[PDB]
Structure formats: structure tokens, C-alpha cells
Amino acid sequence: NFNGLKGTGVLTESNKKFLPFQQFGRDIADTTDAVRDPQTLEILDITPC
Amino acid sequence: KVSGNYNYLYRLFRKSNLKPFERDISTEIYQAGNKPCNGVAGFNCYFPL
Amino acid sequence: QCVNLTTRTQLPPAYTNSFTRGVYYPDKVFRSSVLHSTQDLFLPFFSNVTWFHVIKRFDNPVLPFNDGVYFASIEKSNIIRGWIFGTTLDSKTQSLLIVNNATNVVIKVCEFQFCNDPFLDHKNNKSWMESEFRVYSSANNCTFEYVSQPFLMDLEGKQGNFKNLREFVFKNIDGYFKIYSKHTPIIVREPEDLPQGFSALEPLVDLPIGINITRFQTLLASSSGWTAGAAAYYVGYLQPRTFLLKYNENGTITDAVDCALDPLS
Ligand SMILES: *[C@@H]1O[C@H](CO)[C@@H](O[C@@H]2O[C@H](CO)[C@@H](O)[C@H](O)[C@H]2NC(C)=O)[C@H](O)[C@H]1NC(C)=O
Ligand SMILES: *[C@@H]1O[C@H](CO)[C@@H](O)[C@H](O)[C@H]1NC(C)=O
Ligand SMILES: *[C@@H]1O[C@H](CO)[C@@H](O)[C@H](O)[C@H]1NC(C)=O
């Protein structure tokens, strides 16, 4: 539950590089799969079951 | 108040519909006709405030 | 206190075919190696953008504002100190002013303290020392203040072989005043109409103040004497179109193409 983003899946460490203004990450399906944890500033990767 | 209140001010004399989130503070004299007028009230001289 | 210019020898405004500049990130999201199509306000390719060249002689007239402004400057001298925007009328109406000279970037929105001229004296004969720091005299009432960290403005530079090319775009939408910035470090080429290539405009700042703007003028700096330098800048407008953008593996904008420009487009 990331700021209202209620989802289910597995969370890995994402190696891609974002920008200071960037906060999310989409795909062809336009569903969020790469997120930024507000407290610790690494990048998480979301993969469904 | 018990004797009435007069501190709060407004204006209902504007020419056209303002766009959303537009601020107007200036006290340009309201006109009702093509005759130019300012200051004292009268025909086409009504104060906006 | 401010002192007027007089004896205005205005150069004819030159015209340059703007090749590919003006593409910016539409929103603060991330994509990766995917094409996209977006309807947005833009400056089209191959438009006759207005070129102003500044060489005793100062030329900076007031220009009308319509649907954002794409501004570019190729310089080294750091003469620019901000921008005057709005519907001022000797600041008895609401406007906003920008000062970003050395210490901080300050944006004020007010029924301002005002001058009768952008600069101050202007300068003494040889050097470009700054004095009479007050660029504003007397007001009625103010609305908004903003203070932030100063931008990368290197002070003073050589005449010719300019490297400081900074492109800003100014957008107004229903009180959202969004300024996007991009500075490129080095251009070994001499200042001409030549520069063309690929670039991206990272977003810089947003202001939710909600005012009305109809015209704008720049801000550049008691005796009358100066050894003339070189300054080159460009101003252009925008209109709503739709663009096709190609992303990359890293997540940056590589190429953009118009849709209503050419039949091939
Ligand atoms: C917001 O700014 C516009 C300019 O973009 C101004 O339009 C004025 O509208 C009145 C309406 O009759 C005209 O009499 C003026 O001549 C217009 N100004 C100019 C410079 O032409 C005005 O300041 C604002 N408009 C609205 C609708 O709020
Ligand atoms: C500049 O011009 C304005 C125009 O009204 C005038 O009021 C002001 O005194 C002038 N200043 C100087 C220094 O000439
Ligand atoms: C092209 O530049 C000329 C030079 O004066 C100008 O008159 C004309 O309006 C410009 N056309 C466009 C489409 O910008």
C-alpha cells in the first residue's frame, strides 16, 4: 500500500536509474511496476504472482 | 453586530466572466455605457466597490 | 532608483529557422524503450523564431505574451538578471518579477515597487560593477514570495566563442506557471544560426499563483560608457499540437516528431 497504491506481488531491487523528479514506472499495459520507497531511497521492482 | 456590520467589502460590477483562479484587486471604475466617466457617480459612473 | 536609456537604435529583429529545440518531458513519470504519442503545447519544427542581438546601444523592447514563451540564450557575460512578466502598467496592477543574479533565485508576485527602466544607471565606463541594488521603488500591496537556490550562472566571460547556451520554456495553464530548463556546457562553434541537434528539456519549477499575463520584458543591466560586447538570444511562441516521442533504454527522450507538420510526419 504505497500512498494509496494497493497491489499484490513480489518486490525486488531495481537496477534502473530514475530522476529526482521521477517517482513511478509504467509499461505497455500502463500499470505501475517500478516504484520508489518514500523512506529509503532505493528503487523497487514489482512483479505479479 | 448588534448595530450592523460594514467592514467587509465586495463588488458586483464586473463586465465579463473571469477565468477560473483569477485575482482582481484593482478598483477600475465600473462603466455601464460608452460615455467615459470617473470619480463621482451618475449616469455610467457607478462605483464598483 | 532607475535611469532610462534614451536614443534607442533598435536593430531589425532577425529570423531563424528553429530546427528541433523545444521538446520537454510532459510528466514526471518513467518509461523505457517505448514509443509514445502525446497531445501537448509545443513549438513546431522549422519556425522563424525571433533573434535579438545586443552589441552605448541597448535594445530590449517589451514584447507581448501569448501561450508560453520559448527563450534561448547563448552567452558568457551574465548580464541577464531575470524577467518582467505580466500587465504591469507602472505596477499598479498585478505582476511578477524574477531576480537570479548571484545569491539566490527569488520570484516575487506583487503590485510592485517599480522603476521606469529595467537597468539602473546603467554602468560606469570600463567595468561592469553593480550598484544601486534596489530595482524597485514603491508599492501598494504584495501577494507572493519565493526564494530558492541560485542556478548555474557563471559571472563574466570572453567576447565570442560562447559556451553558455541555456534554453528555458515558460508555460501558463490555469495558474500553473511551469518553467523548464536545460543548459548545455560547451559549444566550440562561433555564434550563428547554425546550432541544430538533439536535446531534452528537464522540468525545473512550478508556480501555483494564478495571475494574468499579457506581455513580458527581459532584465539586463549614473554615467554612460561601456566597451561593447556580444550577446545573442532568441524568443518564440507555442501552440497546441501532438508529438510522437521515442524513448531509450536509460529512460530519456531521444527523438520527437510532429504530426501535423508534414505529410511524412
Ligand atoms: C487577462 O489578460 C488579457 C490579455 O491576455 C486582458 O484582456 C483584456 O480584456 C478586456 C475586456 O474587454 C479588453 O478591454 C482589454 O483591451 C484586454 N487587454 C488587452 C491588452 O487587450 C485582461 O487583462 C484579462 N482578461 C480577462 C478576461 O480577465
Ligand atoms: C525616466 O522616465 C520617467 C518617465 O516618466 C521619468 O518619470 C523619470 O524621471 C526618468 N528618469 C530619469 C533618470 O531620467
Ligand atoms: C518567416 O520569417 C519572416 C521574416 O520576416 C516572417 O515575416 C514570417 O512571418 C516568418 N514565417 C513564419 C511562419 O514564422
Ligand SMILES: *[C@@H]1O[C@H](CO)[C@@H](O)[C@H](O)[C@H]1NC(C)=O
Ligand atoms: C561609476 O560611477 C558611479 C556613479 O555614477 C559610481 O558609483 C561608481 O563607483 C563608478 N565606478 C567606477 C569604476 O568608476
